[model samples]
Target chain A: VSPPPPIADEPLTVNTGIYLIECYSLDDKAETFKVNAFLSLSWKDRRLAFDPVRSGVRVKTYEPEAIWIPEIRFVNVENARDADVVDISVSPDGTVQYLERFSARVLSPLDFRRYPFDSQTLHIYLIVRSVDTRNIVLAVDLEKVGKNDDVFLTGWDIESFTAVVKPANFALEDRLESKLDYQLRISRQYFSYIPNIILPMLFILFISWTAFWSTSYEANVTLVVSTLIAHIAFNILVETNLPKTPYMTYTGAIIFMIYLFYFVAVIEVTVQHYLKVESQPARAASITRASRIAFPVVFLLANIILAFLFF
Target chain B: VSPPPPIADEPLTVNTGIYLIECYSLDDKAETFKVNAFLSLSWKDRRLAFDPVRSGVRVKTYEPEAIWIPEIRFVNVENARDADVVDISVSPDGTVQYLERFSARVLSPLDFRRYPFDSQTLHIYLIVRSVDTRNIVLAVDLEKVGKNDDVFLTGWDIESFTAVVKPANFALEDRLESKLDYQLRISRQYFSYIPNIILPMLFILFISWTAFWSTSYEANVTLVVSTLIAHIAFNILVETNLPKTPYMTYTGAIIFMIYLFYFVAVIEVTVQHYLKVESQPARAASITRASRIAFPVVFLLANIILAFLFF
Candidate 1:
């Protein structure tokens, strides 16, 4: 087969299409996500006109470098490669389309202040390498792009996706280059994280509250201190799955507040002991009785404040 | 310029070269790193032969995709692009060399089980994409590849690097494919962590010991409970820099042990209070005095145990 004739590097208009295959292994600690997709590029070429059925021609393969194909390079590819043979086809009216199926592990910056209750937007950019916007115009057909039914992200719900074309500065160049950005918004299923992280954490905090009811001082102290240790362990387990954020996350707030409650419980017990040692047994008994109600009420109030502040 | 002559699908020997330009970002959250470098690829072609001065030429440009350049791709590339023009050169002995300068942000999985004081290995692989070992051979020069002086990693020190070639099996393929793996070993610099995390933590634990010297039960409880709060805060602050692991870290052990001591102190105070309340003042004072000596001794002993266990 004769190779396609070389086209001049004039203003080339390229219409890009995308169909998301799946998003899996959305690792939070790694702050990297993997995606599989079918990316298509269609452009008009006057030199490559042919009939499909009349000429018995539908698909053809040629050296990509020999043709005037727009250089659409992935801007955020961490690890990417073609999943199948590159498909190049002609639609008989000088319209050329190149479809590529590939999988890529890409970088996405994540903020976990809300953590399990948070919603995240994953972004991927495709830029026209070495070409300015004046030479090549890029656009994406949003109607043709969407998520697959069987997504690999198990614990996340695919909310929506948006594709926007913009001119991005390339290297040190003063002029803006052509680029297309694809954004995928996903929210945590909440059910999974709630059961795995949230409810257990709340239950442990409630366990510490049980120390207020114990009659023996030794048992009270043991309960509260053990709760503190368990709380720390819980934080360690959950944090291994989250990014290290300097600011307090919702989980951080809950854990620290629980630590304070434990401290308060200890102080209250000490005060009651002091009263009894000072021969005020009646007053000591009253204070202990009051805390039984006060501790739980304050805990509920703290939870409300945390929800308003973070959730 | 005309495109290079097509090479057949036969075994092609390619010598690849790499020189590290810079390692600007080594992010722990993403388990990824970035590098900029020059990559030179050389292969033999009988049709391409020329002397530098005799042919009045030193270098030329050719379509990279037109010729059979072994698809030596970055296996972990996060965001990568060619930085400069591709330099294609030819020698009198029919050696064709294609040199490219590029920047790549790539993924490198890390194990942080012994973190903060841990050493990590960062790996980058160059695999012959979709080609078998029988068809394409891959090799890298170990002496030329290394780190740049002005690297960006702040808390890590590069210890060593090694480059090795091996045959790796591709997806469902019976044959092994050629690949080059580059390993860079780096150790965490303890200077930043020691003063910011370790010393302050030890001092806080010691401050909790001051409770033993206090005469009032209230003061003893206040001191210890306050220490618990401060300790939790310390862990939160420092943990933002480390990976989350299920196993207890050295720091985790220290924090939990200090918690145990706080529990012991609280129980001691409770017992002393009970004694005084039962008209055993002399015995209560004696137990308090004994704890003044026993607590510190226990703290020291616990510290030793922790050192033995973690260090």
Candidate 2:
């Protein structure tokens, strides 16, 4: 297959805002497919408010060094290769559409007074000859405005479409308006996914936790050690998400609290067993009561202190 | 208290280098005071090796529009404000010594084609006169190559310090070899913090896993749900660190696999309960056997798949 031609330095300024379309035989002339030049319409002024809020795409001042490639071809810090791009269904008829979303942030070097969004005329040059005949698909409805806006054009074939345009675009989009709202929503969503991700770890830990209660004193030191190993392994696994701040995060604080609680519980339980074996039932009972009360108090105090200190 | 008179620009120019110095306060008035400045060190050349790297200060690129006031402030970000300017150390005797280490980067703008780092030659200036004597004491250590490398310069009156510099020093300096090492060191250090930050989260999710086995059949539903929540919270928390990508990370894949195994276990347990409650002991025993066998098989399969997919 012949490689596509390199973009010209000085584009042929046609002074037109339209889509171009084309068709290609991707599989040995098996299928001559149709594609539209997806022309996302929004005010140049409101370029900031163009995409869905959750989207990572940021449009800053266009740099000659940084060429605008389709998301499918771009590799990022997270997605190191173009393998993540997927082709999926569009219309329920099983007609497949190719799509990929790349995350970016636009940093404007120019002052807004000089290049305000509304006044600037923005053009995305896509090559389609003037005589080409193709469908110019446009996302017409702006129904879901804030959280989700599916009203943007996605797929486009550069060979066929002509003149893609839309109306009523916006800029100045700040999706992260409510930090508390976001954190809470995230927390809840996190909770919802807990069973699928956390239960096995709990199972392994419980095996460790129960061994203390069920077995004879000193008999399960090895078990406790193994449990500690399990805890350590899981600790490494989860640390990938934690914030880099010197202070512990809420989740980390809570996890440490649980571990400390279990550590104390294990020690206390072992001491009680020793006392019982020594035939000091009275002392064991008294010790148990003291520990039972002390544990809760300490746990509560730790929670309060951490809540104040970390969050 | 009478307001002190404004001091004139002192034009304190050093050849170009790191100077280690300690400031002293003798008035015993306040006993201790702290001053933070956005340290901008400009010299003939802003070379790193030729200049010493400052240990205590937080250095940020200067923006003309940025507002610099309120010397001491708190921030959630790791970098201390004006850390590049000075270090506040309280002596055991209640005296304060502003100890600092500064390594200068050559500020040569034009040779960008040959210069390695960002070629923007910014005017680097540090202006913070001592409030005590109106004489803000400053020390200078000029580092020169091949001979006469001075690492210590004694006390100069801070009162004589000035915010403005002479025009001669403003002449463009030669480019220095510094940026490559800075970029490499900073990148290496930033990534080192990753493991420490991510480990605790995995441990927390493990605690949520305990709900599965610790609870009896009757309360298992709630326990399962709660455990699920814990797993999910950790999962989302982990996801927050990386940009959205289609393929699973090692941490994410492990968590996902763990959850899948736990789900199957819960379903099996529920089935066992159903059989037991139906009062078919023989059938229940046989089903329990199948469940035990199936759990390991499913878990093994998940492990294999996850390893192949993620690792």
Candidate 3:
């Protein structure tokens, strides 16, 4: 197969470590593309450079059988281009090669075997190839269409890929780790928006609180059920982010705790509704008041504590 | 001091990891006696024998760089022999020794650095110099007790202190991952019992289904509420094992979806009940029959499918 012609590179740098891609299409005057790049890295450093310890690759000798394992981390920045779809290939010279075609999502960790968890300098390369002069087109296969040049062919997805690891370059590790730490901070912001353990209880409190506004048994039931559903929804949302573990996390505990209380409220409402019908209004009213207050108060306290402490 | 007459050496090998002392009673044998020992570690092969993939002392290197950190792990499967008291000290050439006498909870991972997270390994040499002997008992303050001839005459919380990695060895990693996986399975099991999701509808189903069983409005309400409480209780139980995340997990989402259907059912039940209250006896019975069968059939079907697809 004929190698695609390479376009002139107009490289842009973000931080000292971060790389950015900007494309200019010679074939189509209107075509343009952009890419935000990142590196997969492992490194060690001990000078304590950053707010938290900066990331660097350090080397220390081991006494025979001295067991040591390092933790290598990856962060998916919201703005950076993803690696999965980036065009990747092995060059004939055995150097790994890469060219960014388009951007996508940074899912889970990438191929760790080819990229073992080790401290080193990594560079992600991207080289843009050809672009069609036609207008950017949208497929309309479902509708009948006459053959016509409807849209321009513009930007693309990953076109090719390669990576390199340099060990002697202290600059490589220092720069990459700093960038990673920065990106991690950014991702942490996204994670922060997720109120860890507080989310379900908030939903629960809202639902349960709304129950008081319900005038009739039916409305009460609706609110209660809604509360239940809200927690469940919240639970699912939270669980998606966590890896499967043997024990319940604090959030899991809180979810169950809220559900338990909400369920109790459901029963309490039902009993009161029934007693009201049986014309035993006195007994019904008394149980209802005691339980409604007790359940909510107890649940509130329990959930608050659990979310903060145990969760 | 004549080394306290070498009180009968007791040699034992422990697994190379952390262990908590579940129970310790050095006072089982003699009185006013202290025991000390030295631990030497020798490994068969050096895993990290090369120039090392990465290098630098954490004290020297700086951030964005990563270096592998080593750990020292030790555990005690069997207690020390007939010694009345024990004091364990660990240090490299006895410079900064960490001491942990016997205690009820196994102690491991003694902190050399005050930093919350620091990776450092110091050679642990246990020197059990009995403060108390049968003649004149030595005095030392323990962690929670005064000087005495019992276990931990002078002790820290650490009974078995050893270093360990966070992501652990591959074997350990697999084990932890397995546990996480099991946690998810249980979470799903527990969510099934949630009141808002399963219970409401189940309660509604029973309420509608049991119309023949009960003739009173009050009884229906009472039963539904009771069942709902049961559901919530179960939900709580399930939630205990889950982690709190921002978004809904599959289990939580399903639970929430279930509750949504239940709320609608409650609202429908109220309308149907009121209609029955105004209708003639025969007409009321017929209307309820159709209502019960139709509502659940449609509602349950929709719920099952929606939950199946969406959840």
Candidate 4:
């Protein structure tokens, strides 16, 4: 089927919408999600027009095979859109009503900079590859664009499904494509992460401070080294749950800083033991006391700086 | 209006249902929750019978005051059920259809046996009190018994809303109350507890074991004693989030066992110090090594036992 003929030298406004029906998968590691929704479009086609009084019908149904439908496809979908035509109807004025229910594994990249407590705006790029004889411009159907009441993603709260109404570049006419951004905003439910990753990791680091309360080689060495091993296990566990990112994350920086604390702890432990062996117990005590005061102080101060930088 | 006259001396069967509209305020501490739902009851009423042809309507709507509606109330509700009659429909055969939108604060006792990882069955006790002259029997409307898709309890996963069908004792005829158990089963999300309470508490205890590696009285005293302080803080923090229970919770057993561990660690540290001061360095070293083995072994074994008992 050919594209609809233009009226008054104006491009056909193909109103588009994405109404989500089922929200099943939200994979953090893959930066993808499986979505089921209705992709709807409406446009005027003069060829399908008829006199309402003579036809005795305001709207008439038509199959996709009998219709001149537009070529609309997702830009960032992982595979071909698995879709089934739900309905097609035309008014007496030739305004076509169309909808196709589809399920696709959408490749929407997420920002993990604040991960473990990150909010993400997932995108579904819809584009109409302008073929012969049509300057088809995409328009948002604000009324039809929404998430289903039952649409739920585990570990994430879906906020909204919005079709961003941005002005397209009107300058480009030749070889141009009409596109729309379907943004699905979601906030991560981090109730699990705080108890699971952050606070547990902090405990080991806080427990490492016990070494500062002492001044003996064997005891201090065992303290720092053994706690370091537990810290190693914790870091591994945290990384297991984290997605690999090219850039550092807020939680990631704090996790890395933890290693620095462990390294410096070993230094403090070794130096204090060295001075004690040299019969400088008085001087070592003074150093230990200073470290005891400064370790948590710097630790918290650095944490505050990191928090501010991220926020 | 009074009780509907029973035919053939049979008791009236009032089919009941609770379709949840809104589920909010699941308080973990107070063991109370606020709920909004549709309370629907259906029963055959011979007095309201009408021919479909004569009435010119298959179903007819009625006011609650114009019908002989049975009295039903929630047994465990903290306050009076605030109800608004939504609709009352009667069919050609005089089968009455009823619905009421009600909100109430329900007091359902929760078992804290496995708190911080507990699953609770919240009960909404639906009861029909029988007065003189009529035996009103309570039956479940299986079709309408469910939670709405939008029913979300923060930090908890809702599993099922089941109406337990059980035999009401037919022998108890004199002022017998027919009751039904509407169980809303939910599982708590204990993600925060592990990091915030469990692991942090464990770290302080494990770090205390470092004292077993040396025999300096001053350092050993500081190590065991100072970690005891942090452990104290950790316990207080954990208890704040936990609900008070008459019996010990799984986490409660673990927390109490922690204090026992600290107490024993102090004893071991003192005994090691006493032996070291008596110039029995070899004996003290053996004791320290043995303690390092016994502490972790008993700790893990006890953990396994506690886990088994709780599970």
Q: TM-scores of all models?
A: 0.60, 0.27, 0.29, 0.58
By TM-score, highest first, what's the ranking?
1, 4, 3, 2
Q: Judged by DockQ, which candidate is best?
A: 1
What's the CA RMSD of model 4 in angstroms?
Answer: 15.0
Whole-model lDDT for model 2 versus the true structure?
0.33
Clashing pairs in 4: A195-B192, A195-B195
Q: Determine the backbone clash count of candidate 1.
A: 4
| Model 4: per-residue Cα lDDT over A222-310, one tens digit each | 67655666665675566546544446788777866776787678667756766775689899898899999899999989989998999
Which digits, one per residue and each the tens of the lDDT, describe model 2 over residues B140-253?
322211111111111112221222222222112431111100000000013323334334434433432332232135444443454455566656655554444444446556
| lDDT head-to-head 2 vs 4, winner | 4
Which of candidates 1 and 4 reaches a greater TM-score?
1
Superior candidate under TM-score, 1 versus 3: 1
lDDT for B27 in candidate 3 is: 21
DockQ-based CAPRI category assigned to the predicted complex of candidate 4: incorrect
lDDT (Cα, 0-100) at A204 in candidate 3: 64
Candidate achieving higher TM-score, 2 or 4: 4
- Cα displacement (angstroms), candidate 4, residue B259, comes to 1.2
- By lDDT, the candidates rank as 4, 1, 3, 2
Q: Would you list the rank order by DockQ, best first?
A: 1, 2, 3, 4
Q: Model 3, which residues run further than 4 Å from truth?
A: A1-187, A190-204, A207-215, A230-246, A308-311, B1-311
Candidate 3 chain A TM-score vs. reference chain A: 0.38
